[PDB]
Amino acid sequence: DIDEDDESGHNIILNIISQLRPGCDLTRITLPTFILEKKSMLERVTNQLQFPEFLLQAHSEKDPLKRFLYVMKWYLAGWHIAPKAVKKPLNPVLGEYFTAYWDLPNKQQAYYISEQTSHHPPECAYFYMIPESSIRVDGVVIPKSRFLGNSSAAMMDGSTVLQFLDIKDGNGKPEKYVLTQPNVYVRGILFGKMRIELGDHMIIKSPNFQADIEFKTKGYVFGTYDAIEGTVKDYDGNAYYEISGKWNDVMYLKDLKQPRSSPKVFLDTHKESPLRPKVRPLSEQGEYESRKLWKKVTDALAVRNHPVATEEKFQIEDHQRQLAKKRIEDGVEFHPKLFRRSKPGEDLDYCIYKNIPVDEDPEKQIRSILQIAPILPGQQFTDKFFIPAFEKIKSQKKMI
Amino acid sequence: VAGATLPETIPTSKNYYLRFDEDGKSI
């Protein structure tokens, strides 16, 4: 039964590992389908966006340090929404895209648009906005796979930029937060049992505050799994708060100006109610839209038919290898449909192609967002959807 | 340049009452 399946899975992974040297990447290694969850990475990102109420709280908070704490709460809250066993999202194909929306309790909507912008090396970009609350998020996920011996990792080199568009600094520009991502490990692959862990550092930086949060691994005897430890500081070396606890249990905040005080509950992940994204029905989705593209694989995963899931996934990835060969033959390269290459020196590799002026009427911002790609039920693709973003911005100003 | 067609009315918190009941259900 399951014990015999576990032994064969063990054998399959050992035979892959036996040929590798610690320190190498895994870009050329195909992993088996029985470590896959039923969503692509483009959708997995939205797990981290399932607690918008904390972001709405931050936006309404006038004190910069308190506002920073709510942003940290928003960002830390999503990590525990993750598969239970040892599973990873599907690696998206080049040009795959995924859109979603939320119906928020305040009668507003949040919108999400994402695209896989590169395959070698893998990269996806995402855009998230709540126009009627003047909240905008732009980000990139850049996973660099690594074999380390008894462990493997996705070294997470992406980042997220959050802006409160109507909270202006001295320069009149929106208040900006940059947030990085901890690395995702699987440990115990050689002499143990596989377990997923977060590790290394998460950095959160605002105009006047910063936090460095270390995601720790357990010791042999001391410590616990899934522990976090960090400090909220200004940029002059003053420490204001200490964060502690576990990112998938209870996180605590200690006021460092009150030495005798004890850490208070900051985030109890077992008492939070996530808000899940909504998506257009499958009948309206495009060929390379995430849920539609992977539907045959995820259907086979859902019935535990791993021969079929493996064959369906190979067909998709083989087709992509053929498309890449055709690009070389035509002497062209891929360019994303929905994201334009950022200017040099900026935090992000890609940004959504559409110009959305920071202070225009949020109804006009919503209309611009909905023109980018079908998000809401009933919206249809236009012919222009499929042309590259760089060709779309050329016309977005050629008419001007 | 638009990649998608627009709803006949752009949805906002301000026209929510046109799209939902006073009991909160769709119409």
All domains of chain A, ordered by start, with CATH? 2-268 (2.40.160.120), 282-398 (3.30.70)
Q: Which residues pair with A215 in a beta bridge?
A: A200, A228
CA distance B21 to A219: 56
In chain A, which ranges are continuous DSSP H helix?
2-17, 41-47, 52-59, 64-77, 290-293, 295-302, 306-330, 362-372, 389-398
Distance from the A362 Cα atom to the nearest Cα atom in chain B, whole angstroms: 9
Helix (H, G, I), strand (E, B) or coil at A337: coil
Determine whether the annotation assigns residue A28 to a binding site. Answer: yes
Tokens representing A184 are 């995702």
Test A376 with B1 for CB contact under 8 angstroms.
Answer: no
Which among A175, A141, A142, A152 has a CA at the least distance from the CA of A71? A175
The bridge status of strand A339-341 relative to strand A109-119 is unpaired
Instruction: Name residue A50's amino acid.
Output: Q
Test B1 with A392 for CB contact under 8 angstroms.
Answer: yes
Which among A237, A235, A215 has a CA at the least distance from the CA of A225? A215
Test A378 with B7 for CB contact under 8 angstroms.
Answer: yes
Distance from the A40 Cα atom to the nearest Cα atom in chain B, whole angstroms: 22
**Number of Cβ atoms within 10 Å of the Cβ of A292:** 16
Nearest CA in chain B to A378: B7
B15 CB neighbours in chain A (<8 A) are: none
Helix (H, G, I), strand (E, B) or coil at A167: strand
Which among A99, A122, A119, A121 has a CA at the least distance from the CA of A45? A99
A176: exposed, middle or buried (C-beta count within 10 Å: 0-12, 13-18, 19+)?
middle
Q: Which residues contact A375 (CB under 8 A, 6 or more apart)?
A: A99, A100, A101, A111, A112, A113, A280, A369, B4
Which residues of chain A are at the B interface, by a Cβ-Cβ cutoff of 8 Å?
106-109, 132, 337-338, 362-363, 366-367, 370-376, 378-382, 384-386, 392, 395-396
Tokens representing A237 are 């070396």
Q: Which residues contact A308 (CB under 8 A, 6 or more apart)?
A: A296, A300
Which of A109, A371, A386 is opposite residue B11, by nearest beta carbon?
A: A109
**Number of Cβ atoms within 10 Å of the Cβ of A272:** 16
Distance from the A392 Cα atom to the nearest Cα atom in chain B, whole angstroms: 6
Q: Which of A108, A356, A370, A384 to mutate to test the interface with B (most CBs of B within 10 A)?
A: A370
How were these coordinates obtained? Answer: X-ray
**Number of Cβ atoms within 10 Å of the Cβ of A13:** 19
Nearest CA in chain A to B9: A367
Determine whether the annotation assigns residue A26 to a binding site. Answer: yes
Distance from the A389 Cα atom to the nearest Cα atom in chain B, whole angstroms: 10
Determine whether the annotation assigns residue A201 to a binding site. Answer: no
Tokens representing A251 are 């996180």
Test B2 with A395 for CB contact under 8 angstroms.
Answer: no
Which among A119, A73, A66 has a CA at the least distance from the CA of A96? A119
CA distance A55 to A327: 42
Q: ∠ at Cα A249 (A35, A279), nearest 5°?
A: 55
Q: ∠ at Cα A95 (A163, A84), nearest 5°?
A: 70
CA distances from A216 to A147, A156, A159, A348 (A): 19, 16, 20, 27
CA distance A334 to A388: 9
Judged by a CB distance cut-off of 8 A, whether residue B6 touches chain A is yes
Q: Which residues pair with A98 in a beta bridge?
A: A114
Q: Residue B17 — φ and ψ, nearest 5°?
A: -65, -25
Q: ∠ at Cα B13 (B7, B15), nearest 5°?
A: 60
CA distance A101 to A109: 7
Q: Which residues contact A364 (CB under 8 A, 6 or more apart)?
A: none
A395 CB neighbours in chain B (<8 A) are: 1
Q: Which residues contact A67 (CB under 8 A, 6 or more apart)?
A: A58, A59, A61
Q: Which long-range contacts (CB under 8 A, 24 or more apart) does A245-254 make?
A: A247/A76, A247/A79, A247/A80, A247/A198, A247/A215, A248/A79, A248/A80, A248/A82, A251/A76, A253/A69
Q: Which residues contact A83 (CB under 8 A, 6 or more apart)?
A: A37
CA distances from A227 to A179, A218, A250 (A): 19, 8, 10
Judged by a CB distance cut-off of 8 A, whether residue B3 touches chain A is yes
- Answer yes or no: are the C-beta atoms of A255 and A241 closer than 8 Å: yes
Q: Which residues contact A322 (CB under 8 A, 6 or more apart)?
A: none
Which among A277, A256, A253 has a CA at the least distance from the CA of A267? A253
Size of interface A-B (CB pairs under 8 A): 62
